Structures are given as C-alpha cells and as structure tokens.
Symmetry: C2
Subunit: 345 residues, 2 copies
C-alpha cells in the first residue's frame, strides 16, 4: 500500500509518527507491503517553498493510494494572503482529488461514557458515521446574491451529485452494520423529495443494506435522544455540516475524532483537531485521532476492515489503561502509542 | 383581559379548563378583569359546522386580545380533504392574525434534571427560548422546482422580514435575562451576512439587551454542551425549526412544553403536545403545558411578567410534589391543578 504522509504543522509530526508506528507494526505482522513517503504540506511548506501545497506534494498525492494527513495551520500564517494560506492548501488538496464525500464518525468507546454530555445510559454504544456531501448544495448553489433590500441563496442538487454521495454511504455501510439513514426535508422541500427519490432508487442495487429516511429536524432530536440506534447517516452539504458537528459533541472530546474524504482521486484521512502549536515538541499530544485516521485508511482505502477494527479495539483499551493528559491522565504521545502497540498482538 | 378559548379535541377540553382554573384564581386574587369565551375549533368544529375554523370563531379571535388554544386533530379527521382538516384550521388561524414569530421555550425545572438526556450537571439551569421566523425563508422562497435532472429551492429574506422577527426577540429578551443570540450562516451564505447585518442594526434601538451572533452549526454543539448559557435565540425559519426541535428534547418530556405565536394580530398560545384521544375523559392528562401556555399569555400578551413567573414557580413545585402519570406519578389532571393553585397563594 502506497501512502503519502503529510505531517503538517504543530503537533502534526508527532501524532503522524505515532500512527506510522502502528502502521509499521501491522506491516511487520501482516506483510501489508507498506510503502510511504512524507511530503511538505501547510505551514511548513509555506516557509520552505512559499506555498502550502507545492508541486512535489501534488505529484506525491497523485502517485499514492491514500493520504495520511496531520495538522495544518497556525497563527504564524494567519496573516497571509488567502491564496497561500495553510487552510487554502487543504481546499486545493480536496479539489485536486475531486473528493465529494466527508466521512465523520462519532463513537463513544466503552468506559468513556463519563466524558459524554449525555447520560451514560444513552451515550453507551454510540457509533454513528455521518457521510456529508461536500461539493454541492446551498454553499455553492446559484443564483445567490445580496442587495440593500434582500439576500438569496439556492439549495440546488442534480441527480449525479446525489447518486455519488449515496453510493459511498452504501459501500461504507456494507463494512459496518449495513444500515443507512438518508436525511432530508422531503415533507416541505422539492430538493428534499428529489433527494429521497434518488437515494431510494440508488438503494435498489444494494439489497444487503437497509435504507431508512429521516427529516433533518427529527434527526436532530434522535441524535440527542437515541444516538445509539444509528450506523451510517447520509445527507446534503449544509445538513451534513450541522449534523456532523452535533454528532461531534457526543463523545465529549474533539481530540478523539478522525475524519476522511472520499471521491474520484486519492482519499484523504486526517484528525479533526487542530495543530496546537503551544505544545509542539513536548510529547504529550494525544495521537488517538491520528491512529484512528490510520484505521479509517485501512478500512476505506484498502478494505482491510478486520485490521481497522483491531486497531480500534487497541486504542479503546489504551484510553482506559494509559489515559492521555487531555483525558485526565499522564500518558504522553509515546507512552500511549506503546500501549496501543501492546494490544495490537 | 379578553381571552378567546379554543379547547379543541381529545384532551383539549380537560387541559384547557385546568389552565382556566389557574387564570380565574389569579383573576380573583389580582382583579385582572378576566373575560373569556370558548369557541369551537378543530375536529369538534368540523363535526358541528363542517369546517375546522368557522366564522363565529374567526370573529371571536379578532375580538380577543389573546387566544388560549388546546389540542387539535385526530385519526377521525385524518382522512378528509386538506381544505377542511384540523391541521389546516391551525394554518388559517396563524395566517388570519399574521403571526410571524414562533416562541418555543425549553426549560429544565429544578429537580427534574433526571428526565433530561443530558447529564444532570449540564441540564441544570437550562431556560432557553427559541424565536423562529415563520413566514419566510426556504420553506416559501422562490424560485423552487424539480425536474428529472435536478431540484432547487431558494433561501430568500427581505429586510422587513428580518427586522420584525428580530424586534420580538429583543422585546421578549427584555422580559427575561436581556440576552439575545442571533443564529445564521454568515461565514458562507449571503443571506447569513444579510441577516447578521440587519439584526446588528436593529439592535441599536435596544441598548439594554446584549446581542450575540452564532453560526447554526456551532449553535447545535452549544445546545448539547452548554445549553444553560443561553436566554433568547433568534433565527430563520428552517434553522429555527431544527434548533427548536433540538432544544425540545432537552427537558426530557414533550408534555411539559408550551408555545406561542406572535405577530400583527391576536397572539396564540398553545401546548406543543397532541390531542391524545385515547385518554380523553379519564382525567390523567397532564395540564402542565396548558397552564404554562397560560403563563406565556400573561407575559407576552399582557406583559404581566411577575404573574407569569409566579405561575411557573407553582407548576415547578407541583411537578415535584404531585407528579402526573407521564412523570412516574399518580396525580390526575385535577389533583395536579389543585397543587398548582395551592402554590399560587
């Protein structure tokens, strides 16, 4: 497996290496034929090359089968022209690979229910994966405009945009508990009915996955009341943006969340947390999200579901055994990784 | 105070009378000059007059200063032409009075934190009031359409639509903790920036109320993480529909929720719960939402904030002392009301 590693800024290098320590361990034990190369990206790239997504890195991403991304950005590059900012480089990466689906999982690991803002009885067993359409919807729809008297924006979707995001939700579900819930606003909106109609049609080719439809307002209530009853949720851009953020707060810690973006090109896997420059080089940075991103990579980029689950079980145990600082513990980056590896046998 | 009472269907008559028992008690003790008349509405009206919102009732609502509404609808009238359905009558009522703002409070009464899906530490102290714009936005915006290839809907807002809903949020806030949070999607959408711009301008006339802006996706997270830090929240139609439903689940019981709709005409106050025909005439129906609707009426229709708060404190105590069936208790409608009245002295 050819992996392009883009450590990035702040704690990026540290947490990314921790994930590689896990990947190399699996490679030794299973002979995955792991081949990777680290390329400059983000702030580190601006300071070295003048741009956040330099040519060699662009080629590297094209050459790879997956991208393991660290953290990007920082105060140091916040005051630069948009065209060359770290954040912009992320946009360029996604666009170059035509990634149209954003996978955003929220899971409450056993024993960590205490960290959830929900009562332990309801937080228990949560393992939902939100699939959000990234390229269309009201965020890009036209017409759009503003005047002194009014403002307008258009929520527009064509059949192919809905079909493609829907297909990844079904493929993702096949690797999980085979249940998808498509979220729309069909009882009021034309696009809502169009969306539902298309997803029901696309579903016909996936007889092994159960399809369910839900209204966005109702889904918001279910995520707080009975979040444990879902598996895969697929929805539009703005709805997915809201629902994934809502689902984010369920585990009670942003540091634990991994994320992925799938599409036509090389898939990208990255931790949801920022670079946290203030603690760069001290150890201490929680590598959970980076390691879990590595697991997402095995599952979605290579289909190694059995292995991804093994890595996931290992970190679950590591969180209880040697909790990192952000979880009221003292286990630094290396200590935590050692425990993960300890359970990967 | 001239009040038009529309008991409605199912448990409507029972719960509405319980609220009147509270209003009459206050009227005796304070000399409110309460004057009310009950008019046929909803299902009861269809069976008696052939339509859910008959002429005498329309006139009655116009003649009144406020409308105390019970429950409406039922399986018996579900299979009728839309034009004459109970639900349609509600639409006609709102339209006839040009009510453009929907007040939707969610409160976790002290001692009832156990009922919340949130941990008791965070459920404690929640008292948020969502003000939702009812007449505009994507639900009514044009253009809108659907074809075999695509579908579209328009989120459009004119300055006067934003200005008016914003003013009620400020007036409502003045009666509460004087803090408003306007929710938009300004960092991405034109209408979002237009909305924020207008609400900041309108706010200048209300120096005694603190104004804050929040993004809808962020607000979703705050409502689950730190819901106790808000007072009044004002937002658009679709955003308000989602956020009010989300906020609804916080107290852990739909039966406790009251609601109001303000605008140019006679304001309407009604419990959020349905008619629950199956238990009509048995007693047992929880009158909390109806009594709390009566309190909302005193506050918003007559400005009797001090009295509304007194009624609210009474029910709070009643819920702990003589819990109704739906809260794991045995107190029927009358028993519960008696306790409320007991504390209204």
């Amino acid at each position: 497996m050819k992996v392009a590693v883009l450590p990035g800024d702040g704690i990026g290098p540290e947490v990314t290496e921790a994930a590689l320590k896990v990947l190399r361990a699996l490679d030794e034990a299973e002979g995955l034929g792991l081949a990777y190369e680290v390329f400059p990206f983000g702030g580190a790239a601006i300071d070295a090359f003048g741009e956040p997504f330099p040519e060699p890195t662009r080629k590297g991403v094209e050459e790879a089968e997956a991208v393991l991304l660290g953290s990007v950005g920082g105060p140091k590059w916040d005051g630069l022209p948009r065209k060359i900012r770290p954040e912009t480089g992320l946009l360029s990466l996604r666009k170059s690979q035509d990634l149209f689906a954003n996978l955003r999982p929220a899971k409450v690991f056993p024993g960590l229910e205490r960290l959830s803002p929900l009562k332990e009885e309801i937080a228990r067993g949560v393992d939902v994966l939100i699939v959000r359409e990234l390229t269309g919807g009201i965020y890009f729809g036209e017409p759009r405009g503003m005047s002194e008297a009014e403002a307008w924006n258009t929520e527009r979707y064509s059949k192919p945009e809905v079909e493609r995001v829907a297909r990844v939700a079904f493929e993702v579900a096949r690797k999980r508990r085979k249940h998808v819930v498509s979220v729309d606003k069909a009882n009021v909106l034309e696009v809502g009915e169009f969306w539902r109609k298309t997803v029901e049609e696309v579903g016909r080719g996936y007889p092994d996955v159960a399809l369910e439809h839900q209204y966005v307002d109702a889904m918001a209530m279910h995520l707080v009341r009975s979040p444990a009853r879902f598996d895969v949720v697929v929805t539009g851009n703005i709805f997915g943006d809201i629902l994934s953020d809502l689902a984010s707060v369920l585990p009670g810690s942003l540091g634990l969340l991994p994320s992925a973006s799938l599409g036509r090109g090389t898939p990208v896997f990255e931790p949801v947390h920022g670079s946290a420059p203030d603690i760069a080089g001290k150890g201490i940075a929680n590598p959970t999200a980076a390691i879990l991103s590595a697991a997402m990579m095995l599952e979605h980029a290579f289909g190694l579901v059995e292995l991804a689950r093994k890595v996931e079980d290992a970190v679950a145990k590591a969180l209880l055994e040697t909790p990192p600082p952000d979880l009221g513990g003292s286990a630094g980056t290396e200590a935590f990784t050692a425990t993960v590896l300890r359970h990967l046998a």
